[PDB]
Amino acid sequence: STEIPSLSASYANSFKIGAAVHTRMLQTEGEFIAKHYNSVTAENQMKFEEVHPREHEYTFEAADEIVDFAVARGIGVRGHTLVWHNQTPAWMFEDASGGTASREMMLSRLKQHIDTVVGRYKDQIYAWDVVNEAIEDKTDLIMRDTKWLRLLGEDYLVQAFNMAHEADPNALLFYNDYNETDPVKREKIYNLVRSLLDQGAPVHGIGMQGHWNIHGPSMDEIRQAIERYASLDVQLHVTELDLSVFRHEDQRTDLTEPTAEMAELQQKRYEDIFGLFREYRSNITSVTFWGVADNYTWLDNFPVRGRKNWPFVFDTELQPKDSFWRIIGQD
Numbered sequence: 001s002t003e004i005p006s007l008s009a010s011y012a013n014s015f016k017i018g019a020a021v022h023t024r025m026l027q028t029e030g031e032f033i034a035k036h037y038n039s040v041t042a043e044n045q046m047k048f049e050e051v052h053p054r055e056h057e058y059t060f061e062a063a064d065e066i067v068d069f070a071v072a073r074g075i076g077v078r079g080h081t082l083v084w085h086n087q088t089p090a091w092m093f094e095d096a097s098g099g100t101a102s103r104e105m106m107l108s109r110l111k112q113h114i115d116t117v118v119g120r121y122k123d124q125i126y127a128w129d130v131v132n133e134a135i136e137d138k139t140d141l142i143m144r145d146t147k148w149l150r151l152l153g154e155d156y157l158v159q160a161f162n163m164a165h166e167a168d169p170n171a172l173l174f175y176n177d178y179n180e181t182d183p184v185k186r187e188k189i190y191n192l193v194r195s196l197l198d199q200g201a202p203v204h205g206i207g208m209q210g211h212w213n214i215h216g217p218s219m220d221e222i223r224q225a226i227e228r229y230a231s232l233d234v235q236l237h238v239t240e241l242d243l244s245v246f247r248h249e250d251q252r253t254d255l256t257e258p259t260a261e262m263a264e265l266q267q268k269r270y271e272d273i274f275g276l277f278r279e280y281r282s283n284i285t286s287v288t289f290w291g292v293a294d295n296y297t298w299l300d301n302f303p304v305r306g307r308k309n310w311p312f313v314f315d316t317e318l319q320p321k322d323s324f325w326r327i328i329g330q331d
């Protein structure tokens, strides 16, 4: 604070503005958070392994601290992924002899997991990401080949969405994914959510991760996604928004800060984005950034280990960037 407006305050009549957090920062940057955001997501501390490390042992301490942080300050909470190929302990898929678990073991284990997790924050979490990244990223492959698909069954998303809806039939359940604007994958996601809706599965929205960079997707490529998903009459949430200064499969490894060209493109590119989100504020009800400031971001270690990135509108010192001002809402 010193003379700058609240980012989430300027969108109060448009949509929530959230951030991906961690209990480690609730102390240091708790106030910066409680001022620009009215929604938050646990980046990792709420995933399978993080709260269900062993078959009979649960660990919710970190997650609880987050929810307690938010609800006290009138902030919304999105629960992140119940069913995902990553960050899921081995036991969940194994049997006594080290073999693979059966469809029945799978159904029981998943069921008890969902109840415990969704039920614990019942009526407190307004939105959940039941299934994360189920669609393949290879043009001629629909379903991503995973143990969920193999050991449980192709009807695993339905089960997930059904179980979740019982634990808290008031939460909005989303199907979350990335590359959602890629013309090919965009249709794969569309058909899945369409199949799900027909089968009667309780899906209430689609989760557009928003892991984009300063080059693409084009404004038209995003606009098309929005309209494509929005037509299914479901809510749209940009869930893991960030603007990478690199392209994926970027070989450039010597930057200590972004190139002047990178900053220019980004400031310009962010302005266009939120300008498009505002045009579509009817369809979009929540935009979350995968992080709070450039001081931290998973991009620093992925896909390149040890390569620092600056994907937000807040620099490494929690101070507003030139992109910040070109993004404040009309309210």
Ligand SMILES: Oc1ccccc1CN[C@@H]1C=C[C@@H](O)[C@H](O)[C@H]1O
Pocket (backbone or CB within 6 Å): 043, 044, 132, 178, 209, 211, 240, 298
């Ligand atoms: O496998 C990928 C490949 C490219 C981009 C993103 C992903 C995964 N997308 C996200 C990354 C951050 C994690 O904290 C989130 O849980 C995850 O959903």
